[PDB]
Symmetry: C5
Subunit: 120 residues, 5 copies
């Protein structure tokens, strides 16, 4: 796996506006909400020792809390459908947080593009 895999998805120039932290199944997690330009919302959660993105929990937590504090526009890298518990998915999101980057514009950010390739 890699944050920069050509897969869904990323949102660029996002301001992290909300922060939640809890626990489920003996595992700490946090979820962020951010807004793009345009006033639409992306959510993504990281869970400690989860499946495949669990090893980035500590780094992601510290980084996300940092960017929440600065109010800087950032790129959120996410993977859909990772969380499966239905009440959790309804309240929060199925998206795993898989990475973050600083941005130079609302659309140009540092790091790889996590995006599906196009078909010609």
């Amino acid at each position: 796996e890699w944050t920069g895999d050509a897969r869904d998805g990323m949102f660029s120039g996002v301001v992290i506006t909300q922060f939640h932290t809890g626990q489920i199944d003996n595992k700490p997690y946090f979820c962020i909400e951010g807004k793009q330009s345009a006033g639409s919302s992306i959510s993504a959660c990281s869970m400690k020792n989860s499946s495949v993105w669990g090893a980035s929990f500590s780094t992601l937590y510290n980084q996300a809390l940092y960017f929440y504090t600065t109010g800087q526009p950032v790129r959120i890298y996410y993977e859909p459908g990772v969380w499966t518990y239905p009440p959790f998915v309804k309240a929060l999101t199925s998206n795993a947080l898989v990475g973050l980057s600083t941005c130079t514009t609302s659309t140009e950010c540092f790091g790889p593009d996590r995006k599906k390739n196009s078909l010609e």
Copy 2:
């Protein structure tokens, strides 16, 4: 278990105004206290490596101290009746701290609702 189980409880739009840290039975703990606009006070404590909610000690301490620092209104998610040493319950609370969220209003905050079914 889950922070957003349909169980008591949560208080929304709370400013965290008091903070205490200590140790009991070889484990550090912290406790926070806050009031709503309604003047409704809530305390809850988190213990390191405790039975049910100890996995969250480290995140919740970080988050709580962060929110105590900004003074922003937040959601406190708690579970009553967790701590049982009577002198502890008497000076502090039986409430375990089980989650926190930022809020957009005094009633609406980011995160699940934690409340007994209707």
Copy 3:
């Protein structure tokens, strides 16, 4: 053992004004000193991996530095007679730091009484 056991002692309305960190017998420790309201000093140290209060070293370090930084009046919970190495006691203190609270007045602070 608990921060709130009916034992000596706590001081309330203390501003943490001094901070020291080092190592003895392969264990990091820190010490803090503060004053008020009268103006009598209180010192207390927390040492990692000691027998009794060692488990709270990293939480108290964090919290103590935080309160050193804000300069707010706090409550210091201590247990005298814990450190026994004589040159350490002479330089610093026998008091173990055992807990910390925010205060609403010079006498009223959040959390238990620790008092005989």
Copy 4:
């Protein structure tokens, strides 16, 4: 091995202006980019538990985020050729981050020289 080995290489007097974090092959990593006075560019990544430089990840993350926050000119010590996965290299860099220093001028910084001898 040592940050101050007489190897390639170091960039002095750079402001850290970009920061990325992610995961690859079960390991968190971060990358930074900095620009010099003269406009010239350096990138470098540190990955947890990976390479001979894995042991420095937490210290380097902390110190890199600190310097990103102050915006002061610093020295980036790096080792070219360490990351080999071609999509990672194309997107980011092959450079491992191997140390950091504060700077007194644009060429004078605190620490060892890391130059090929």
Copy 5:
């Protein structure tokens, strides 16, 4: 061993002005440089998992970075002759950082004395 042993040595009333981080032999370390005024310099380094004083690495890193940020005068407690890799000693120092204290004047600071009898 103890920070406040009657041994070489301490410098009081130091402003920490430089900060370096790197790795040697699979261990992260940091080094600081301060000036007394007075006006002379001291350097000291702490290394994670180092033999005698490595238990202290994480607390000292945090504290030294804090005092670098505030720029307040502090006491550095050090032990000469700990680091022995000659290029390391040449570029940096042999001094191990073994403690830190806040100060009230350029010479009066909280904590033990560390000086030879």
